[PDB]
Structure formats: C-alpha cells, structure tokens
Amino acid sequence: AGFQLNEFSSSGLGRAYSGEGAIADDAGNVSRNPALITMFDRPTFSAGAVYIDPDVNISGTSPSGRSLKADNIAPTAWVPNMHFVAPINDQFGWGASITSNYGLATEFNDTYAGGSVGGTTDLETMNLNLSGAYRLNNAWSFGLGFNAVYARAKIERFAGDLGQLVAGQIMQSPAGQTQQGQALAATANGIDSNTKIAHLNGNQWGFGWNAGILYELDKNNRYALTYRSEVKIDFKGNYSSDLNRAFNNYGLPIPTATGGATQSGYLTLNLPEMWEVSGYNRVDPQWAIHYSLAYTSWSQFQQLKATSTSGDTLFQKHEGFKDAYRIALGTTYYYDDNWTFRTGIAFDDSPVPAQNRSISIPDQDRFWLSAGTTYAFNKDASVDVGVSYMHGQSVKINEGPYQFESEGKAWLFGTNFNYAFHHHHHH
Ligand SMILES: CCCCCCCCOCCOCCOCCOCCO
Numbered sequence: 535a536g537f538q539l540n541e542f543s544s545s546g547l548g549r550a551y552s553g554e555g556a557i558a559d560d561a562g563n564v565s566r567n568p569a570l571i572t573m574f575d576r577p578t579f580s581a582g583a584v585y586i587d588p589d590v591n592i593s594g595t596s597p598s599g600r601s602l603k604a605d606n607i608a609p610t611a612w613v614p615n616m617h618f619v620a621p622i623n624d625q626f627g628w629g630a631s632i633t634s635n636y637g638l639a640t641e642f643n644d645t646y647a648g649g650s651v652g653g654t655t656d657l658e659t660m661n662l663n664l665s666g667a668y669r670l671n672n673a674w675s676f677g678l679g680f681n682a683v684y685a686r687a688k689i690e691r692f693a694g695d696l697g698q699l700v701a702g703q704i705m706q707s708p709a710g711q712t713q714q715g716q717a718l719a720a721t722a723n724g725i726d727s728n729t730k731i732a733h734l735n736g737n738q739w740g741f742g743w744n745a746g747i748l749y750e751l752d753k754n755n756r757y758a759l760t761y762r763s764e765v766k767i768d769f770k771g772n773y774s775s776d777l778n779r780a781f782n783n784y785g786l787p788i789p790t791a792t793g794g795a796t797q798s799g800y801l802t803l804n805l806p807e808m809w810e811v812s813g814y815n816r817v818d819p820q821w822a823i824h825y826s827l828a829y830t831s832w833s834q835f836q837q838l839k840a841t842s843t844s845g846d847t848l849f850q851k852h853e854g855f856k857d858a859y860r861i862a863l864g865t866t867y868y869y870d871d872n873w874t875f876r877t878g879i880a881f882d883d884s885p886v887p888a889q890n891r892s893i894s895i896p897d898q899d900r901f902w903l904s905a906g907t908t909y910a911f912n913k914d915a916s917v918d919v920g921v922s923y924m925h926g927q928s929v930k931i932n933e934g935p936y937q938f939e940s941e942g943k944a945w946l947f948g949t950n951f952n953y954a955f956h957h958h959h960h961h
C-alpha cells in the first residue's frame with residue numbers, strides 16, 4: 535500500500551478495515567464515506583489513535599564487502615483520529631474529521647553503507663475534512679467533502695560506501711597509475727559515510743475533495759461507492775547538500791552539491807486519488823458481515839523532483855508506481871448490550887513495480903489479520919479496542935549498485951472512545 539495508511543478508527547482496525555463505507559456503528563466511517571452521514575440520528579463524536587509498530591529489516595552485502603544489513607528501519611507511529619457527525623434534518627447533515635491517509639518513516643543509521651539510498655524519509659499527513667450528505671430518499675444518500683491536507687516531509691541521504699566504490703573503481707582503471715587518478719581516488723575515498731548527500735524538508739498545504747454514494751436495500755444491508763481526489767502538494771522547502779560544489783555538473787547521478795549551503799527547493803508530491811466499493815450485511819441479530827475492494831491510482835506517483843527558484847534540478851528520483859487494489863472481509867458479532875466483537879482479513883498488492891523498489895519505501899504485499907472488541911457503557915458512550923497483525927512476503931531490491939533483501943511484519947494496537955448526544959428536535 536506504498537505510504538498510504540487507512541487507520542482512521544479502532545473499530546476499523548479490529549475488522550481489517552472491511553466494509554468501511556457501509557458500516558456506521560460509529561462516527562469514524564463518515565471520514566471514509568460522506569454518504570454515511572445520513573445514517574446517524576444525533577450528534578456523534580469519536581476520537582482515538584492507532585499505535586503502529588513495524589518490524590521491517592534489511593539484509594545484504596555491498597560490492598565493497600560492507601554489510602547492507604539494517605535492523606528495524608521503520609519506527610513506531612501514533613496515528614490519531616477524530617470524528618464528528620451531525621444530522622441537521624432527516625435529509626441533511628454534516629461531518630468533520632481529522633484523519634491521516636498517507637505517511638511513511640524509514641530510517642537508517644547515517645553511517646549505513648547503502649546510505650546514498652537509505653537515510654531518513656518522513657512524511658506526516660493530517661487530513662482535515664468537512665462535508666455534508668443528502669438522503670434523497672429511503673433507498674440511498676449522497677456525500678461530498680472538502681479536504682485541507684497539511685504535510686510535513688523530510689528526506690535525507692548520505693554517502694554510503696560510494697566514496698570507496700568510486701575510489702576502488704578508479705584504482706582499477708588505467709587512470710589508477712596516474713598521480714591525478716590516485717589524487718581523485720583519495721578524495722573519493724575520503725568522503726565519510728555520514729556525509730550528508732541530500733537534505734529536503736518542508737511543510738505544505740494541499741487540497742482536494744471526496745464524495746460518496748450509499749445505497750441500502752433495507753436498514754440491514756447497504757453498499758457504497760466513494761471517491762477520494764488525488765492531492766498535490768507543491769512544497770516550498772529548503773534544499774542542501776554537504777558535498778563540495780565541485781562535484782556539480784559533471785553529470786553524475788549525485789544530487790546537487792551546495793557545500794552545505796541551504797538553497798531553496800520546490801517539489802510536487804502527488805497523493806493518489808482513491809476509489810472504494812463496499813458492502814455491509816446484517817444477517818442475524820448478532821451477526822453482520824462486511825467486505826470491500828479499494829483501488830488506488832498510485833500511477834499519479836511517478837517521481838520526486840526538487841527544483842531551484844531558477845527551475846534547476848537539485849534532486850530527483852524515479853518512483854514509477856502503478857495502480858493497485860486492496861481487498862477486505864470481516865464480521866462483527868454483537869454479543870449483548872455491553873459487548874461486541876469483530877475480526878477481519880485483508881490483502882493489498884504493492885504499487886511498487888518489483889524493479890523500482892527502494893529500501894527507502896520498504897513495500898511489499900500485505901496480509902492483514904485482525905480482531906477487536908467494543909464495550910458499550912450506555913448507548914451514549916463506548917470504547918473500542920483493536921489489534922492487527924501484518925506479515926508479508928520478503929522481496930529483493932536492486933537500487934543503485936546495491937542488492938538487498940527486505941522483510942517486514944507489523945503489529946497494530948488501537949483504542950477509540952465514542953459518545954452520542956441527545957437527538958435534537960427537528961421538523
Ligand atoms: C537518486 C540519487 C541517489 C543516489 C546517490 C548519489 C550519491 C552520489 O555519490 C556521492 C559519492 O561521490 C560521488 C560518486 O559518483 C556518482 C555515482 O556513484 C557511482 C558508482 O561507481
């Protein structure tokens with residue numbers, strides 16, 4: 535799922551986010567589907583977070599003989615979520631919410647040998663949503679939302695053992711026996727692993743919109759179609775490189791050097807438009823079944839290019855992602871008044887062409903496996919607890935002069951609190 539994430543609710547967590555867009559047992563889903571707004575009677579609030587704990591590890595050996603082994607490169611994260619749905623009439627209502635649909639955090643030591651392609655990579659995303667729905671009739675409704683997305687991002691790359699790989703290569707060339715070759719090799723050989731080869735940081739606002747269409751046979755079965763617009767963030771950040779300005783222009787793959795001087799960079803980040811189709815099915819007073827299928831057009835994400843105020847390129851990297859799907863299936867079991875249980879299973883193909891993979895975005899196909907509970911205090915307040923396990927297939931990665939093998943699992947824990955308000959008098 536690239537650097538996308540769909541942890542907007544702890545209840546969603548317990549059911550491997552299946553159905554989401556057809557279930558309305560809590561306000562969290564209006565963030566997923568605007569049409570669901572017309573499924574609430576009174577003001578509803580929801581808020582909580584998901585603690586994500588990844589276990590991604592890298593392995594390999596550089597041509598320099600140095601270890602490309604990198605343990606625990608994906609740090610833990612806390613993804614909060616807040617939701618509020620407010621019916622106005624039996625025909626209109628509005629909802630706001632703060633969730634996060636995109637994020638990533640990979641970090642290697644700055645002395646890592648594959649540093650040139652594995653330093654630090656951060657992308658924080660907070661999505662502010664405000665939207666309304668319309669119950670055209672008893673059969674189905676329509677939603678539509680406005681999105682203000684704030685993103686913080688930071689990219690840092692270092693010289694791994696490139697300096698050595700270069701020097702080593704220069705030593706094997708005829709240029710080797712030369713006083714200039716040796717000199718050159720010495721210079722290359724001299725670049726420390728932690729020499730910052732690229733620095734990009736910046737916060738920028740982005741906007742977009744989403745919509746949804748709910749359809750229900752009765753009040754126990756429904757199906758939906760939602761759309762999340764692509765979102766473009768043109769960052770106005772700071773760029774830098776610690777390599778001597780001399781490296782510049784020869785036309786090497788090296789980012790622009792600035793002698794450590796901070797330049798002004800511009801880069802456009804393209805968050806993929808999203809499309810999902812889901813269904814919820816109550817099949818007993820105590821059993822319901824949910825499922826879905828999402829489609830992200832990851833192809834809108836082709837590359838990251840940092841530019842100067844004069845249009846010159848400081849940094850650039852080809853991503854070449856492709857569209858992919860996510861499939862989910864879960865069941866909720868309403869025990870009694872106070873208790874409710876759930877479980878889910880899912881699978882999402884990777885948007886990253888097994889040949890365009892990077893260690894910076896350790897991504898592979900993922901298989902979810904979740905379970906969760908909801909404890910109702912009194913029809914007005916409840917708490918949700920979710921847990922999920924994401925294991926996957928190990929992959930091989932050929933980036934730069936390196937060959938790695940990446941593997942990764944993840945544990946997810948989440949808690950949410952929900953509260954309803956009295957149903958307001960309306961005609
Ligand atoms: C997408 C860019 C990331 C690639 C990192 C480029 C880092 C460049 O090198 C820093 C070391 O000094 C110069 C090396 O020569 C350029 C490429 O490496 C060639 C391998 O023999």
Ligand SMILES: CCCCCCCCCCCC[N+](C)(C)[O-]
Pocket residue numbers: 537638655656657687688689734735736769770771772799801803838851892894895
């Ligand atoms: C100042 C601009 C900062 C923008 C950095 C955006 C990072 C988005 C995360 C994608 C990770 C891809 N990678 C390897 C290029 O970092």
Ligand SMILES: CCCCCCCCCCCC[N+](C)(C)[O-]
Pocket residue numbers: 535539586588590608611636637638639657658659896897898899900924925926942943944
């Ligand atoms: C600031 C948000 C940080 C969120 C980073 C989320 C990392 C989730 C880890 C799953 C990556 C593993 N993989 C390859 C199996 O997909």
Ligand SMILES: [Cu+2]
Pocket residue numbers: 575623624957958960
């Ligand atoms: Cu009412």
Ligand SMILES: [Cu+2]
Pocket residue numbers: 956957958959
């Ligand atoms: Cu009232």
Ligand SMILES: [Cu+2]
Pocket residue numbers: 959960961
């Ligand atoms: Cu009245």
